Design a protein around this ligand. Structure first.
Ligand SMILES: C[C@@H](c1cccc(-c2cnc[nH]2)c1)n1cc(-c2cc(F)cc(F)c2)c(=O)[nH]c1=O
Length: 289
């Protein structure tokens, strides 16, 4: 796969040079798969400042407009610095690669579903609070995630949760994968979407708050798939009728109250990420477990 750099706006090509990592500074281990995805796979990699990293290839990119958006996103993300947000180490254009820090304990969904790890309810509430802190930071930068889910959060060697994306939620938002037609597989993005996002394809920080509620539900169920008996074509009407994900067995009542507030049918009535951090920190700090 070859990209015509001359088909891109030259101003954008120069503006992204601080994010660019040259091919000679990076070795990709194509036989060491960290995660396989619809828009590209994640592999183990080695970066030269010797750093162990994760390298994400972009597989289904077909037009120069998607490459322009990829560069525009690289400029935005390069500036982010928060302990609960995955850093962007850099990008490669010569097929496009995203270079991320290596996360020893992988994605949050597989971690909480893991039999050996067995996190306690308190640990799971702690992971939820860390996600809320990363989202409070992203909301402060006016950055809309669009696909916040446990499968998109990663854990480092200290069990620090980092908000991230294994898909391309902000580049490929118009693709079939992010619509109700993606009806097969575990990663069904439509089951994390706010009611207004399902109806009008509008995504805001308030629709990320809805997804955060679904993510808290995934943490409390240790990675159960949401709405198992509701088809992707029926989720909109199910939510419009006022039906919601039920309270998990180990979920404390004040945390389910939080989830119901995240799933408010009126986006403007949902709590902010700043309110979510205060509320979850108070539940966590007095928690005995
Ligand atoms: C830095 C990280 C990250 C951290 C927190 C939130 C998000 C996010 C929210 N909604 C979409 N993404 C992404 N990250 C970045 C890219 C990436 C994508 C690009 F298109 C371009 C580019 F330079 C980097 C990626 O593929 N995966 C990933 O984890």
């Amino acid at each position: 796969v070859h990209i015509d750099l001359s088909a891109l706006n030259p101003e954008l090509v120069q503006a992204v040079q601080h994010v660019v990592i040259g091919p000679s500074s990076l070795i990709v281990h194509f036989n060491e798969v960290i995660g396989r995805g619809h828009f590209g796979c994640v592999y183990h990699g080695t970066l030269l400042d010797k750093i162990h990293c994760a390298v994400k290839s972009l597989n289904r990119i077909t037009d120069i407009g998607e490459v322009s958006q990829f560069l525009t996103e690289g400029i935005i993300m390069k500036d982010f610095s928060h302990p609960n947000v995955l850093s962007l180490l850099g990008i490669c254009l010569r097929s496009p690669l995203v270079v991320l820090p290596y996360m020893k304990h992988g994605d949050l969904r597989n971690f909480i579903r893991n039999e050996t790890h067995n996190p306690t309810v308190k640990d799971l509430i702690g992971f939820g609070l860390q996600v809320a802190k990363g989202m409070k930071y992203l909301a402060s930068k006016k950055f809309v995630h669009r696909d916040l889910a446990a499968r998109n959060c990663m854990l480092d060697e200290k069990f620090t949760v980092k908000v991230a994306d294994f898909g391309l939620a902000r580049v490929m938002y118009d693709k079939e994968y992010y619509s109700v037609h993606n009806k097969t597989g575990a990663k069904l993005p439509v089951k994390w979407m706010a009611l207004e996002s399902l109806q009008t394809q509008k995504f805001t920080t308030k629709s990320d708050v809805w997804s955060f509620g679904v993510l808290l539900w995934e943490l409390m169920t240790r990675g159960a798939p949401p709405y198992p008996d509701v088809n992707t074509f029926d989720i909109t009407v199910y939510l419009l009728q006022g039906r919601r994900l039920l309270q998990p067995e180990y979920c404390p009542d004040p945390l389910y109250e939080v989830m119901l507030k995240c799933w408010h049918p009126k986006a403007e009535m949902r709590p902010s990420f700043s309110e979510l951090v205060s509320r979850i920190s108070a539940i966590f700090s007095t928690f005995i477990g």
